[PDB]
């Protein structure tokens, strides 16, 4: 609808994907983080990440809850195809 | 056999055409050579897909592309292009039985 | 714009001042034809998008499997309900976030934007 | 106007409290401003 | 950002919309009517245009938003203009 | 710097076995046309669009001194990978080039002429098309594009 | 209390710094000698200036239009009634202040929407 006004030193495309963009980071850190005050001190996850010898907390939320927004160059995954990312979606689809 | 079938329909072939009506007709390619230009595109790509998929006279693993945006029909018959088999849905059913 | 060819050698007419006069002359060289000017301007360019999508798109696109349908914005030339909604996606915009929407129905070409 | 070899300029204020500027108050103390700060994406720093 | 606008290269580009080459061979007269009246003004006043002019014309639109954002005037311009070509260039600026 | 700019782009065109690049509408001269209008035809599809128009006024104005098919043929022969000994075996040469190492696809009789000029304005066509951004630039690694 | 010149330039700025006067009839309204007010402001103009280069011919342009134009009738009327004395009027700064109230409200404005327009750093 054309209501969205950009960030300044930002275009109009850039200020849409880095709302999308904040959305789902803050979604996933939400998720992993009540994904971690779920974990019972016996969970062998938490035993190894807590003593630091392997793993962390972000490998825990991926297996546990979401594995997150792939990226790719630093960016969403872009059109290789005509306006899609692959030929099971309608064009110009912007959805996570 | 591609560019037989199509001058059998109604295609005009480059050297017997004014340039005028170019802009208003779908320019077709066959292995990237222009053949012609057609006044009706999706009555040919209709006609073209039941013929392959009926295999009367074009064989399977001929490509037709219709760029509906550009207004071009590429068909496509040489080698080494890559393709997979994929199940044939109409009226958002399937042909499978 | 001066997109004028010669009648006689069909290249193109050039513009010239006719300084006994004070008037443009399109005048094709190497064939010296003269046509009378009127337009005035001899070249115009745009540097801030003086150009709109909606003389771009093709009807033809209702046809698309690929693109989306939504019914929600029926036709101003027939009333049909659905139509096909798109973004341009091309240059001289930098931001297709708008949407073009064409008319589901054969025969009725017509388009919009939101 | 504006100096060859540069492009558009960034203006903003640093979170970071390294670019921020650090001044010692009259007690002694160190206060980090929050102040305007350009960011170019090109160098000419004589003309600057 | 008045120190910005000193930095930041602003060419010509920048802050106009669109630019068109006409013939106009009578000065005092105009193929544009909207130009007259103002056109008038500098020509109550001719300098270097006493009865005559070189019979062509440049008409350049100047981007309203970007001489705001870039706090240029129109005598600005009109002195790099003629500074750049000395008396080459008579330019002849709308009122701000 | 001097005129460079007033001219702007200008579109060439490189064939094989020629050590140098030559302007497009002197290759469709060299293919029998004079009038321009029969050459943007091959080009321009609709002549009312007129961004496209001036999109070719640069290579038109530099190719004006040429009208004539032969003095094409010269001037192509003179810029040949193999120079001819004179003139006409210039010509020639451009000739058999044109006819054979450019577009072979389209075909390689004297016929296909009107073929592969039309092929070659559907390219400048396409160029233009993304000079303008009204068609994406085709990805290399696309593909579709691959054999 | 104009000092007179002979020189055509100045003469010339002057009595076309009348005919904008003139426009509106305010002068009739108001009853005060336009052509001296023009031969004050052209004198300040100078002094201002001390020259006839490119800023003083722009700079009495620049006030003729802005005399002449009927969005801004109040200005003329101010200047002719004496409520802005001619000296002050030699040297206004452009459109900044030297303007209809409308243009001065859309001109701040914009001022505060170009504040939203480059702020940043997310
Ligand atoms: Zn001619
Ligand atoms: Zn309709």
């Known amino acids: 609808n054309n209501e969205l006004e950009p960030t300044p030193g930002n ?11 904040r959305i789902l980071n803050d979604a996933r850190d939400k998720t992993g983080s009540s994904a971690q005050k779920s974990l019972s001190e016996y969970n062998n996850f938490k035993s190894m990440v807590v003593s630091g010898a392997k793993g962390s907390k972000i490998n825990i939320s991926q297996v546990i809850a979401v594995v997150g927004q792939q990226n790719v160059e630093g960016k969403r995954i872009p059109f290789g195809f005509k306006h899609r990312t692959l030929p099971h979606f309608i064009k110009d689809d912007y959805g996570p | 056999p591609i560019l037989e079938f199509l001058e059998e329909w109604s295609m005009e072939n480059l050297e017997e055409i004014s340039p005028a009506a170019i802009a208003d007709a779908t320019k077709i390619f066959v292995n990237g050579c222009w053949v012609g230009i057609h006044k009706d595109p999706e009555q040919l790509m209709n006609t073209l897909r039941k013929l392959r998929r009926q295999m009367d006279i074009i064989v399977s693993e001929v490509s037709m592309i219709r760029d509906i945006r550009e207004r071009e029909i590429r068909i496509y018959t040489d080698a080494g292009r890559i393709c997979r088999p994929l199940l044939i849905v ?8 | 714009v001066g997109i004028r060819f010669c009648q006689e050698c069909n290249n193109m007419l050039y513009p010239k001042e006719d300084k006994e006069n004070r008037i443009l002359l399109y005048a094709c060289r190497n064939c010296d034809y003269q046509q009378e000017a009127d337009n005035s301007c001899i070249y115009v360019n745009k540097i801030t998008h ?7 798109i093709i009807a033809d696109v209702s046809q698309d ?12 030339k027939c009333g049909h309900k659905e139509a096909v909604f798109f973004q341009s996606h091309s240059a001289r915009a930098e931001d297709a976030m708008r949407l073009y929407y064409v ?4 025969h009725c070409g017509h388009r919009w934007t939101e | 106007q504006g100096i060859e070899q540069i492009s558009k300029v960034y203006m903003h204020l640093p979170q970071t409290d390294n670019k921020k500027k650090i001044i010692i108050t009259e007690d002694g103390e160190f206060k980090a401003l929050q102040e305007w700060i350009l960011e170019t994406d090109g160098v000419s720093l004589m003309r600057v | 950002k008045d120190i910005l606008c000193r930095l930041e290269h602003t060419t010509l580009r920048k802050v106009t919309a669109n630019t068109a080459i006409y013939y106009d061979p009578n000065p005092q007269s105009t193929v544009v009517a909207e130009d007259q009246e103002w056109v008038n003004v500098y020509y109550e006043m001719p300098d270097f245009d006493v009865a005559r002019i ?17 706090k240029l005037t129109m005598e600005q311009i009109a002195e790099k203009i003629n500074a750049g070509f000395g008396d080459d260039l008579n330019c002849i600026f709308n009122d701000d | 710097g001097a005129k460079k700019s007033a001219i702007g782009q200008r579109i060439v065109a490189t064939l094989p076995y020629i050590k140098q690049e030559v302007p497009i509408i002197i290759v469709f001269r060299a293919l029998g046309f004079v009038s321009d209008r029969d050459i943007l035809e091959h080009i321009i599809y609709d002549f009312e669009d007129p961004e496209m128009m001036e999109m070719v006024k640069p290579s038109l104005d530099e190719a004006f001194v040429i009208q004539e098919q032969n003095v094409a043929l010269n001037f192509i022969g003179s810029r040949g990978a193999k120079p001819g000994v004179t003139k006409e075996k210039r010509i020639k040469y451009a000739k058999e080039v044109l006819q054979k190492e450019m577009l072979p696809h389209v075909g390689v009789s004297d016929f296909c002429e009107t073929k592969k000029a039309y092929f070659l304005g559907y390219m400048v066509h396409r160029l233009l098309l993304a000079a303008l951004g009204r068609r994406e630039l085709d990805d290399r690694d696309h593909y579709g594009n691959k054999r | 209390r104009a000092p007179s010149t002979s020189d055509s330039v100045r003469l010339k700025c002057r009595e076309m710094l009348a005919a904008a006067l003139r426009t509106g009839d305010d002068y009739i309204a108001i009853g005060a000698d336009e052509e001296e007010l023009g031969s004050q402001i ?10 006839t280069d490119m800023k003083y011919k722009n700079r009495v342009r620049s006030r003729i239009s802005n005399l002449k134009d009927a969005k801004n009738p109040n200005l003329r009327k101010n200047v002719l009634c004496g409520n802005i004395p001619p000296d002050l009027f030699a040297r206004m700064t452009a459109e900044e202040m030297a303007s209809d109230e409308l243009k001065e409200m859309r001109k701040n404005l914009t001022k505060e929407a170009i504040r939203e327009h480059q702020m940043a750093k997310t």
């Open chain 1, 11 to 21: 275009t109009l495309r850039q200020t849409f994907e880095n709302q999308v963009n």
């Open chain 2, 90 to 97: 109409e009226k958002q059913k399937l042909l499978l039985k």
């Open chain 3, 103 to 106: 008319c589901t129905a054969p």
């Open chain 3, 65 to 76: 499997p690929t693109l989306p349908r939504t019914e929600d914005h029926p036709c101003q």
């Open chain 3, 50 to 56: 003086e150009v709109d999508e909606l003389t771009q």
């Open chain 7, 42 to 51: 052209e004198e300040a103009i100078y002094q201002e200036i001390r020259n």
């Open chain 5, 54 to 70: 070189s019979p062509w014309l440049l008409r350049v639109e100047l981007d309203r938003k970007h001489m705001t954002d870039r």
